[PDB]
Amino acid sequence: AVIRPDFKFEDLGVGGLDKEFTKIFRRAFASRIFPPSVIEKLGISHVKGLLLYGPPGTGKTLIARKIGTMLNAKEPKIVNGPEILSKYVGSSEENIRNLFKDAEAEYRAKGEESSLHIIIFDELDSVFKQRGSRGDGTGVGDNVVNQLLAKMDGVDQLNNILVIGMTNRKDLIDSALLRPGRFEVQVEIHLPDEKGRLQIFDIQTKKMRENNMMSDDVNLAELAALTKNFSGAEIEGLVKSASSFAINKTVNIGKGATKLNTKDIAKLKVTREDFLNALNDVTPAFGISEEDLKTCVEGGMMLYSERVNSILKNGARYVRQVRESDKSRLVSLLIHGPAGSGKTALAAEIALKSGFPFIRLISPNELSGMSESAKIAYIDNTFRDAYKSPLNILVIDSLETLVDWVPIGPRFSNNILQMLKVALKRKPPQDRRLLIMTTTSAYSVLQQMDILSCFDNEIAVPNMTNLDELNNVMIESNFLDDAGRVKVINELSRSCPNFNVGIKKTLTNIETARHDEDPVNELVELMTQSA
Amino acid sequence: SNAVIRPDFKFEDLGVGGLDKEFTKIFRRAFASRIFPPSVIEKLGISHVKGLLLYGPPGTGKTLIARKIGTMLNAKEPKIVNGPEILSKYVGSSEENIRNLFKDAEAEYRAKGEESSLHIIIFDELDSVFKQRGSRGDGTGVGDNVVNQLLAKMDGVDQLNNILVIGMTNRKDLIDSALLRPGRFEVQVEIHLPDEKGRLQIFDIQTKKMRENNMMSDDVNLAELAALTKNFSGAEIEGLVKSASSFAINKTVNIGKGATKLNTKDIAKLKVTREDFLNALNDVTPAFGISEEDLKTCVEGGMMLYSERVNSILKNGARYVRQVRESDKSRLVSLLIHGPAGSGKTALAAEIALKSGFPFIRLISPNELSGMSESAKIAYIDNTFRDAYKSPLNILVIDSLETLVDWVPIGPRFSNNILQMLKVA
Amino acid sequence: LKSSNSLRPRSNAVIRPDFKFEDLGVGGLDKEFTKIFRRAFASRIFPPSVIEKLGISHVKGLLLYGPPGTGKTLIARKIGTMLNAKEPKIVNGPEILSKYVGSSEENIRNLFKDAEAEYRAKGEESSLHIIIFDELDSVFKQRGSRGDGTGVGDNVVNQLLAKMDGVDQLNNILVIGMTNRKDLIDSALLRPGRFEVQVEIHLPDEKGRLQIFDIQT
Amino acid sequence: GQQIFSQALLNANRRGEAKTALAEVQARHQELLKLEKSMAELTQ
């Protein structure tokens, strides 16, 4: 009738998109399950138009390909976009109205008993662009829209036709076709989640695992964890790229001649490191984040003192609070202290430990080179993006630099400042939560801006002063031997007991002294001038 | 029976100098699936890649490679297409033409299945027609359709699995995004300027038959020449050889002054000497090595060591150069020279710079920016910094920071945006 | 003809040894003529054997630039019509643009067919061909720059690039261009293999003025 | 401040007349061949 009696959808290649399959089935073919008598008794018309769309490489073509064999359907008629057009006058139009004869003849022939005829237009946007483009030329690029529109709207009671049009960009489609009676239902296909990711890996590696061609070492769960933003196509590319490494161990291409170890051909087997190399090869095209924060803490922590621990505990407390309560849908925090003491690393570390679904940072680094309007738009889009996921953490870096402060005017960009002022007080949409951490080094300037009133709590980060903490960082850095680390501190105790540097400068000085002369005469010397 | 890549084959016989690390990748990713038992690869349940992109700056050798791959691989004759050759007047002839290229591959693939021979088509210069669909380019709407047809034919709803497409370009950022997805133009390779060893290889390749036909003097030392030609690309060494030949050959005929001097004795002992090359260095000039001429010109007045503080500062500079060269975690070091005006700062900084021997050296001065608009300046500055993230070791020199930010004490007046850019950068 | 041994510079020489720089009629410029004639018209006189043992392909480009009214077109003309080669295929500045979607670039493709045909048919003994672009700086501007809102400013330059040096070789042509502003021509046209020798032509010195006066009267 | 292109389309004009300039030559040609054959017999 309309679905084969022998089918369950488990066997099919498409995996990871199951909700979408149920929506399509419910809203498209559901009305053609019962006997016809019911539908007219209920006064419901059938659906006629479908639209599928998503980013490039998401699997839509796979669906369009397999659905015909999937549901006991008449062999769908496939036409790619730019072939409808033709040279001779009137040829394109007749070509469009040359597809519908068979279904319409069956309709006149057999009334409502007529079977379902499905035609799918790959690449809908190619020809059916906006019909008000202009150009003063050959009008074949418009009458085609008119022809399809006439045969689809003024159908003359043809109620046994479903057109499925697939595209990558809805925006280019002529608006005249997006209206009731004409492509009513639109289904978005977006990037897969993690579980569907695992499904895709499993589907891809079926034939591999069956033929004992993969080493038992390989663990799919780890791989699925690693591939943050990979679509199905990228996953397949990964699979075959990883395979190429295993392939290229027996056949030594270029070097030497063709040396095929006929024995190892039967012992061919893929291993984890090959997959890792493959991961290094392919890259995603979406990215967004989860790399900038990681590189922002590359130098790592040292826990030279309790202060670090206390601050971290407070951050853990706050993330717990925003995670638990439902009345607290927005919290803002300030992190202020002396320049170079190290602020950014701490906030990045807290955010990384939080493990929320959603994380990004905003830094002057990204915004560099843009015009003011571009910067405003960028920040606005970033914020609007943040209002999406159920839980969100946002980090703002070096606020003073974002506002272009120089003290001689004093000159600064007011627009950005006031935009930020309004934005940091905006509660997100209903049943969403947000957590803001902003860092600065010029507390007093902010106080003059009088913008101190939208911060719920402030955190100081005093730089270190006691020689013990210096010994801690020095032992961690492995600058010298044990006796060296002792003698230097004994010398520094009397050379200059009062001590105020920070953290970054210390590591810099350690490295320089390592390079030239790791004796006292360099490290202690510089340490003394800096303080 | 017809394994494409010819059982005994070496990169040495290709005839391309330098780029020893790329061919490895190309052959590993592309041809490492087609010279194996069909049963095994069938068990492996994978499909051969069908895309290839080669991009880089002009003259780096990105058309030689395509030709040799076309000719040396025991496949069907390659189907060359020049850049804007596809389009046509009549409506619907452009799109048809781009689907006439695939007919024979499909024709073979239906019949002989997985025993057909490789078909290879080379698009020269992709970015002319396959721009990002969506703008308003022509007012007719042809380019979108051509991009469309290519999209639908490279992957489409039908499987081909016996085809290969090669592409070349100088600007990769205008190619429409959908082409670059895996499944279409998978492997992408950058071809950049050579290093010294690559330069030596190229000199060896070019002056090959030179040497074995005993037409080269015994005085020329190729290592020395490779050491002289610092920023030469692959396409200007050939110019050098041609010029050296012209100097050597002009000594006999004496064009213009008087002919008939061409006689067997003169032409029976032709030999290109070393002087000819040195003379030829005055004709061919780099295009990317245009900034080092400024630096050498800045110290034209000459260095005189009237004291010893000069020695001390120079030694400190050399120490710092060594430190950056030898370190691994110190990937960024910044220094300042200050002192009374007229004290000779720029000369000293350049003078330190030139002895470093680093691959990459560049200078920004008010000189380059004069006459430009503000947006133009900021763009130039950003470009120059982003260019400095390519080579392993790089040196950058900024002259007269105060004048770059356009300082005058009367107001005080100055441009804030450039200052911020520099501070951020 | 056929010389068993002791063959000629060229059975049909392009320069023909009865030649001297006092016959052109261009006064003043003297070193420029030397450099031009050495870099370009030196590799087409020696016997084919030695040049073939040397494996150096003849230069296929010449650019002349300078202030207005200095003598560029004169030089182009004299070179065109005082040699032993096929007739020049002159093209003026914007002579190439055509109406329909695909005619300009076809027009550019049209210029090379006789040369490729004869090179294919014969090989190394094909007679030289010359085509002269007048006032090069009209259409061939830097790609990606402001102007040419229509999509022609790229395709035209593109076809020419692909056609002067592509996967298929050709070494029986010599192309010459003339201009007042070389700072606007595309950068990829000024590399070795495409417009190799560039010459500035400047205002005359005093002795050169004496030469010009003696040439005119 | 902009600029325009133009295009061509071939119109039934040729869809018919040019295809007819094959069919209608070879077929009248068929009549003429018949004439020639008959004249050959008559001359014999």
Ligand SMILES: Nc1ncnc2c1ncn2[C@@H]1O[C@H](COP(=O)(O)OP(=O)(O)OP(=O)(O)O)[C@@H](O)[C@H]1O
């Ligand atoms: N407990 C710690 N607190 C801060 N930084 C630490 C700590 N342990 C290790 N570090 C290291 O100290 C460095 C801190 O540098 P960071 O860039 O945060 O300084 P900053 O003050 O934010 O810089 P700026 O002065 O430009 O604002 C990092 O390399 C970080 O890994």
Ligand SMILES: Nc1ncnc2c1ncn2[C@@H]1O[C@H](COP(=O)(O)OP(=O)(O)OP(=O)(O)O)[C@@H](O)[C@H]1O
């Ligand atoms: N690395 C190299 N090895 C061998 N030959 C080289 C190399 N680099 C340049 N050449 C030679 O110099 C010329 C390079 O011209 P080529 O065909 O590569 O143009 P191109 O670099 O592709 O120009 P564009 O990329 O701007 O189109 C050829 O004659 C080539 O043989």
Ligand SMILES: Nc1ncnc2c1ncn2[C@@H]1O[C@H](COP(=O)(O)OP(=O)(O)OP(=O)(O)O)[C@@H](O)[C@H]1O
């Ligand atoms: N030891 C030296 N220190 C400085 N200059 C030297 C030294 N030895 C020689 N010179 C010469 O001194 C001159 C330095 O002039 P330079 O233009 O560098 O001065 P400057 O102060 O950088 O210029 P400005 O006044 O515009 O800032 C050059 O001619 C250089 O060759």
Ligand SMILES: Nc1ncnc2c1ncn2[C@@H]1O[C@H](COP(=O)(O)OP(=O)(O)OP(=O)(O)O)[C@@H](O)[C@H]1O
């Ligand atoms: N060196 C010269 N010797 C003799 N006559 C000269 C010389 N230079 C210029 N002339 C005279 O100038 C006339 C015009 O010069 P020409 O045709 O070169 O113009 P042009 O340089 O092409 O100018 P434009 O840049 O405007 O195109 C020539 O016909 C010739 O009589």
Ligand SMILES: Nc1ncnc2c1ncn2[C@@H]1O[C@H](COP(=O)(O)OP(=O)(O)O)[C@@H](O)[C@H]1O
């Ligand atoms: N569940 C899946 N999602 C996405 N891609 C998949 C999936 N399963 C397999 N693939 C692979 O990804 C490709 C599908 O891409 P396709 O739908 O043609 O991209 P486009 O969106 O351009 O049509 C095929 O090569 C297919 O083998």
